[PDB]
Amino acid sequence: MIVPVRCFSCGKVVGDKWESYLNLLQEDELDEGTALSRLGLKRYCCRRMILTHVDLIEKFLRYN
Amino acid sequence: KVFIGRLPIMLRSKNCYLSEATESDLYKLKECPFDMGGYFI
Amino acid sequence: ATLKYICAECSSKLSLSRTDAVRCKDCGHRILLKARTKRLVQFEAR
Amino acid sequence: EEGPQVKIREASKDNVDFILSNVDLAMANSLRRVMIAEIPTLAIDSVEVETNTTVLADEFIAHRLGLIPLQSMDIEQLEYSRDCFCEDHCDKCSVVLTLQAFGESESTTNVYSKDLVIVSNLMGRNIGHPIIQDKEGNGVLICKLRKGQELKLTCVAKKGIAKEHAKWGPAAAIEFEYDPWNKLKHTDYWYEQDSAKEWPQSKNCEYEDPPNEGDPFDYKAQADTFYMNVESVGSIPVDQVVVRGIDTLQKKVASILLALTQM
Ligand SMILES: [Zn+2]
Ligand SMILES: [Zn+2]
Ligand SMILES: [Zn+2]
Numbered sequence: 084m085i086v087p088v089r090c091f092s093c094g095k096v097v098g099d100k101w102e103s104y105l106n107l108l109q110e111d112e113l114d115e116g117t118a119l120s121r122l123g124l125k126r127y128c129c130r131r132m133i134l135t136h137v138d139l140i141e142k143f144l145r146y147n
Numbered sequence: 148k149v150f151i152g153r154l155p156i157m158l159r160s161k162n163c164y165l166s167e168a169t170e171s172d173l174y175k176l177k178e179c180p181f182d183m184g185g186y187f188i
Numbered sequence: 189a190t191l192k193y194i195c196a197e198c199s200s201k202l203s204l205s206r207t208d209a210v211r212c213k214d215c216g217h218r219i220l221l222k223a224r225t226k227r228l229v230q231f232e233a234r
Numbered sequence: 235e236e237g238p239q240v241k242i243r244e245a246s247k248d249n250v251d252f253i254l255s256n257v258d259l260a261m262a263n264s265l266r267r268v269m270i271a272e273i274p275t276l277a278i279d280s281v282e283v284e285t286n287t288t289v290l291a292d293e294f295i296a297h298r299l300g301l302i303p304l305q306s307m308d309i310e311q312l313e314y315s316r317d318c319f320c321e322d323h324c325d326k327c328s329v330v331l332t333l334q335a336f337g338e339s340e341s342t343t344n345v346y347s348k349d350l351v352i353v354s355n356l357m358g359r360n361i362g363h364p365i366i367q368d369k370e371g372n373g374v375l376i377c378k379l380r381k382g383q384e385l386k387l388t389c390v391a392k393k394g395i396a397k398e399h400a401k402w403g404p405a406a407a408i409e410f411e412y413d414p415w416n417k418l419k420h421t422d423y424w425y426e427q428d429s430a431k432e433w434p435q436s437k438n439c440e441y442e443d444p445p446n447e448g449d450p451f452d453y454k455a456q457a458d459t460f461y462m463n464v465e466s467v468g469s470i471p472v473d474q475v476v477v478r479g480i481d482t483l484q485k486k487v488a489s490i491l492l493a494l495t496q497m
Contacts, residue, residue, distance in 0.1 A: 084290060088301040088374055089467075093407040094400060096303060096467055098374040099367065102344075126407065143289035144342055144380045145174040147199075224285075231281045231293050233300030233389070234399055 084139050092128040100124065104133050159184025194221040250472050251409070251463040253441075259412070259457045266410050266462075269479040272395050275402045275469050276306040276329065276361055279394060284386040288377055295377060299389055300401045302347040302374050304329070306469040308359035312393045323390055329362040330354040333387040337379030345385065347373035353388075362391065365468045404470045409463035414438040417445050418455055 086101035100122045107118040119130045159166050165178055173180045192203040198215030201223075211218050239255040254262055281296040288295065315327035323330075332351045337343040347364040348371060356362060366373040377385060396403030413420060414436040423429040438461045466472040 084294070085298075085377070086375060088298050090406075093465075094403055094467060095406040095465070096367070096374065098298075098301075099372065101375060102372075103368070140289055140378050142180075144378060146177065146289070147175065228282050228284065229292075231283070231296040233277075233279050233281050233296040233401075 084143070086136050086138070087132065090126075090129040090132050093126060095124075095129050097124065097129055097132045100133060101136070101138075155187045157185060157187055158182070191223045194223050195219070196221055245472075247471065248468070249463060249465045250476065252461075254460045254462065256458060257460070259460075262412075262460045262462075263410070265476075265479055265483060266408055268482045269405045269408060269464060269475050270403065271397050272482050273404050273470070273475060273478045274306075274309050274393050274395055275404050276304045276309050276312065276391050277394055277401045277469075278302065278304065278331065278389040279392040279401075280390040282388045284388070285384050286387075287383045288379060288385050289383075290377055295385070295387075298376055299333075299387075300399070302350070302376070303365045303467050303469040304331075304391055305361050305363040305365060306404070307471070307474070308361045309393055309470075311357075311359050312361060315392050323392070325355045325357065327392065328354065329356070329391045331362070331389045331391065333376075333385065333389070335377075335379060335385045337381045337383045340381055343379045343381075344372075344375055345377040345379065346375055349376075350389075367468055404466055404475050406465045406467050408465065409461070411436060411438055411461045412457050412459060414442055414461070415445055417452065418457060419451065420457070 086098045088098040089095060090097055103122060104118055107113050107121060108115065113121070115134060116130075119133055122133075124130050124133060156162050163184075165173065165176070165184065168176070168178075170180050190203060191201055193201070195202055195212055195215060195217060196219035197217040198212070200212075200214060202213060202220060204210075210220065238257040238261070241253040241255055242250060243253065244251040278296075278299040281292075281299050283292050283295075286292055286295065312329075313327050315323055318324065318327040320327060330353050332353050333345070333349060335343065335345045335349060348366060350364045352362045364373050379385070394402035396405075412418075416423065423433055425432045441461075442459075464472060464475050466475050470478065
């Protein structure tokens with residue numbers, strides 16, 4: 084619904100990386116993988132975390 | 148004029164409110180913008 | 189000073205019951221929401 | 235200083251790569267397991283929700299709170315709540331944190347873990363503080379509000395071990411390898427045409443002499459050297475994942491001597 088706080092598998096915090104990831108795509112124009120590696124998410128477990136999140140709360144917030 | 152009845156109306160048919168609505172309008176109305184219609188209540 | 193009910197639609201603490209109707213005060217909408225206890229609810233964060 | 239030898243190769247606030255040298259596999263794996271499972275640490279473990287008009291549910295939120303890593307350098311000087319003589323919690327067994335948020339702006343208001351206020355007396359033990367590692371110092375995103383929406387909570391943190399729930403774990407991944415060339419034949423390599431063409435060389439091979447094709451297998455060799463790399467989430471600095479790791483084992487073993495004595 085939100086970025087999960089950690090990688091389910093290794094525990095690395097990853098919930099402090101969502102705004103940055105999305106800034107790193109739209110503002111500085113990197114491809115999704117270069118971006119993830121810049122935030123230091125280098126095992127495929129953590130990468131899967133950000134790369135496959137879906138921010139559904141951004142839809143939930145349109146209701147009144 | 149002269150009433151003869153009640154017709155259950157299919158969601159997102161031309162007759163139902165949702166078919167003209169925009170995305171904002173669907174959120175104000177509490178209807179998920181991904182619902183697709185085609186059934187009755 | 190209190191809560192009891194809420195208006196599903198026009199968002200506004202109603203508070204009423206029996207011989208009272210089941211509608212509203214400043215939208216006329218027939219749908220009401222019960223409103224959260226004050227008894228405090230605790231979660232284990234697990 | 236004879237015994238198990240150390241050899242750091244990299245270090246960073248966040249990781250420490252090293253080589254243990256002159257130990258058994260068992261002790262090396264055991265210290266791995268301890269670092270993962272049994273170093274004490276501090277974590278939200280009770281949450282009371284005064285208000286939440288948020289688009290998330292409470293336990294969804296609560297769960298997320300227990301996962302925000304919270305400073306834990308002084309955690310020997312917090313007693314386990316179950317060991318303390320208080321009724322429930324207090325300042326000897328608990329930090330209490332607060333969270334209030336209201337979507338004041340038109341645009342969407344985020345709630346981060348810096349918005350966490352400690353409300354209890356620390357006795358100047360460095361514990362409790364939300365850890366923050368991003369450039370903007372926001373730490374973790376907990377929630378999001380819309381204009382009109384509110385969230386008010388209290389939390390109690392408590393000392394805990396990842397055995398009990400992983401939120402209390404200080405370590406993240408722990409790299410761990412040995413015998414990069416395969417000289418010990420502890421593993422037997424699957425392949426289609428050639429085992430060496432088809433498997434990638436570990437980084438740890440440079441460090442260690444390739445074997446020579448003649449060399450008839452060495453039956454006597456043992457696994458004596460281990461390429462580790464511990465990574466910390468931040469509630470405890472790193473070097474300290476290791477040292478309190480070594481220290482936690484050493485105490486487990488001693489509780490065994492202590493309990494022979496009591497027989
Ligand atoms: Zn991971
Ligand atoms: Zn109303
Ligand atoms: Zn206490």
